[PDB]
Amino acid sequence: MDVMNRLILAMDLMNRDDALRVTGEVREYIDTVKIGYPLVLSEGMDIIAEFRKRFGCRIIADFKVADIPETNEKICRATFKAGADAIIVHGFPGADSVRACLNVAEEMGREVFLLTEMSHPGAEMFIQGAADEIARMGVDLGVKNYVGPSTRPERLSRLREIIGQDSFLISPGAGAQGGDPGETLRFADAIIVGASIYLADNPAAAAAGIIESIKDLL
Amino acid sequence: SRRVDVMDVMNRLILAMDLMNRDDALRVTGEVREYIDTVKIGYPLVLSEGMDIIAEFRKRFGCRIIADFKVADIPETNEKICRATFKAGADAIIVHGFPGADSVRACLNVAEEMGREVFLLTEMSHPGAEMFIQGAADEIARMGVDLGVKNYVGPSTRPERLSRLREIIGQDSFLISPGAGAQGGDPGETLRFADAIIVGASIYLADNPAAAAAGIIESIKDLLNP
Numbered sequence: 001m002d003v004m005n006r007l008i009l010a011m012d013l014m015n016r017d018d019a020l021r022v023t024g025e026v027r028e029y030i031d032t033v034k035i036g037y038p039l040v041l042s043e044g045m046d047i048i049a050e051f052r053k054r055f056g057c058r059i060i061a062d063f064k065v066a067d068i069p070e071t072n073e074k075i076c077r078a079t080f081k082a083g084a085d086a087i088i089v090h091g092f093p094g095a096d097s098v099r100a101c102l103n104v105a106e107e108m109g110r111e112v113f114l115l116t117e118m119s120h121p122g123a124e125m126f127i128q129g130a131a132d133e134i135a136r137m138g139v140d141l142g143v144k145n146y147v148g149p150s151t152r153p154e155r156l157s158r159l160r161e162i163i164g165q166d167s168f169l170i171s172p173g174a175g176a177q178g179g180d181p182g183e184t185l186r187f188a189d190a191i192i193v194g195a196s197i198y199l200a201d202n203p204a205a206a207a208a209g210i211i212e213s214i215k216d217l218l
Numbered sequence: 219s220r221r222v223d224v225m226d227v228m229n230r231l232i233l234a235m236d237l238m239n240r241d242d243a244l245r246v247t248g249e250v251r252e253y254i255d256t257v258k259i260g261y262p263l264v265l266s267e268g269m270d271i272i273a274e275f276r277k278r279f280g281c282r283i284i285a286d287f288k289v290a291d292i293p294e295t296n297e298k299i300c301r302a303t304f305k306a307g308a309d310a311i312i313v314h315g316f317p318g319a320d321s322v323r324a325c326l327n328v329a330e331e332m333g334r335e336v337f338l339l340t341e342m343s344h345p346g347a348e349m350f351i352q353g354a355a356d357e358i359a360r361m362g363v364d365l366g367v368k369n370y371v372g373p374s375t376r377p378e379r380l381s382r383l384r385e386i387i388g389q390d391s392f393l394i395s396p397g398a399g400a401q402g403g404d405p406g407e408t409l410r411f412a413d414a415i416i417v418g419a420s421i422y423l424a425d426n427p428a429a430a431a432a433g434i435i436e437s438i439k440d441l442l443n444p
C-alpha cells in the first residue's frame with residue numbers, strides 16, 4: 001500500500017470528539033490511520049466506519065488479534081464489516097490463528113499485518129526470541145505486511161532480511177517510546193506515530209515537523 | 219468454590235458467549251441461567267454490539283462478567299484497554315502473558331486501583347499454541363506467580379499440561395479452562411486440575427442450549443459441590 005508521507009497516525013484518543021478533531025487537523029499530512037481498542041472500546045466499532053467515510057482515509061484496525069482460529073475468524077469478519085482496510089494480528093499464537101485471519105481478509109479484499117516483534121521492554125522476555133521464526137512463518141503463510149519495532153532498528157534490519165524487499169513493513173515506537181523516524185525508515189516503509197502527534201499542543205505542527213525531519217526520505 | 223478465597227462459579231461452568239448478535243446472545247444466556255452464573259464475553263460479541271452489552275447482561279442476568287479481551291499490547295495501551303473495560307462494568311479481564319511482565323503489570327495495576335480481577339492466559343487450547351506459546355508457558359506461569367497473579371487460564375485440550383501448570387501456580391490459585399466440548403477437551407478430566415471449565419459452541423449452537431448445559435452438568439455431577 002502507498003502511505004502518504006510514510007506516516008501512519010496511531011489515533012489512541014478515547015473520546016470521539018477529540019479523536020475526530022485531531023484527526024481532522026492532521027488529515028492533510030496523513031492518509032492512513034491506525035485505530036485500536038482504546039478508541040473502539042470507548043466509542044464502538046462504528047467509529048471505524050465513520051472515520052473512513054468522513055476522512056476518505058485508509059483504516060488499519062490495530063486489534064492485535066491473538067485468539068484461537070475460530071474466534072480470530074469472527075473478529076476479522078466483524079472488523080472488516082465495519083470497513084477496516086487491514087487488521088493487525090499477533091503471530092505468537094501460531095500458524096492456524098494467523099491463517100484464519102488471512103482467509104477472511106482474502107474473502108473480503110483486505111490485508112493482514114503480522115506483528116512479529118513488539119517495541120516495549122517486555123518484548124525481550126518471550127517475543128524477541130520467537131520473532132525470527134514468527135517472521136519466517138509469515139513468509140511461508142504468504143503474509144506480505146509486517147509490524148516491527150522502531151525502538152530496535154537492528155531487529156528491523158533482521159526482520160527486513162527475512163521478509164524481503166517487496167514485503168511492506170510498518171513500525172511503531174517512534175517519538176514517545178524513543179525510536180527515531182529517520183533511522184526507522186532505513187528499514188520500514190512507514191512509521192506509526194501516536195502521542196507525539198495527538199497529545200501535542202498543535203498536532204498539525206507536530207506532524208509537519210516529523211515530515212520535515214524525514215523530507216529526504218519521501 | 220474449592221477455596222473460600224476464589225471466585226465462586228455455579229456448576230464449575232462458564233459460558234463463552236460468542237454469538238454475534240444481541241437478540242441471540244441474550245436469548246441463549248437467559249435460557250441457561252439456572253445452570254450458569256458466570257459469562258465470558260469476548261470480542262466477537264463486543265465488536266458486534268458494543269461495550270454496553272456488558273451493561274445489558276448485568277441488568278438482565280446479574281451474572282459475573284469476564285471480559286475475554288486477550289490483552290496483548292504495550293503497557294500504556296494495555297492500561298487504556300483495562301480502564302475502558304472495567305469502566306464498562308466487567309468483573310475481570312483476560313490478559314496474555316507472552317508480551318512480558320511490564321504489559322501484565324500494567325493490567326494488574328489498573329485492576330488493583332479499580333477493585334477488579336486479572337486472569338493470565340498461560341497456554342492456549344488450539345494446535346497452533348504448540349508453535350511458540352507452549353514452550354513459554356511454564357515461564358509465563360512463573361512470571362504470573364512472581365507478579366502476584368491469582369487467576370489463570372490454561373487448556374482443556376491438554377490436561378497433562380494443566381497438571382504442570384497447576385504445579386507452578388499452586389493450589390491457592392484459581393484456574394479456568396477453555397477447549398472443553400467443541401475443541402475436544404473432556405470436562406471431567408479437565409476439572410481434575412481446573413476450578414472451572416469454559417464452554418462455548420457446544421452450548422450456544424445447540425438446538426436446546428439449556429439441555430446442552432444440563433447434559434454437561436450431569437456428566438460431571440460427581441465433581442460438583444462445593
Ligand SMILES: O=c1cc(O)n([C@@H]2O[C@H](COP(=O)(O)O)[C@@H](O)[C@H]2O)c(=O)[nH]1
Nearest residue numbers: 010118119172176177193194195292295
Ligand atoms: O510493538 C508495538 C505494536 C504496536 O501496535 N504499538 C502501538 O503503536 C502505538 C504507539 O503509540 P505512541 O507513538 O503514542 O507510542 C500504540 O497504538 C501502540 O499500541 C506499539 O506501540 N508497539
Ligand SMILES: O=c1cc(O)n([C@@H]2O[C@H](COP(=O)(O)O)[C@@H](O)[C@H]2O)c(=O)[nH]1
Nearest residue numbers: 068071234342343396400401417418419
Ligand atoms: O486457549 C484458549 C483461550 C480462550 O480464551 N479460548 C476461548 O474460549 C472459547 C472457546 O469456545 P468453544 O467452547 O466454542 O470452543 C472461545 O471464546 C475462545 O476464544 C479458547 O478457546 N482457547
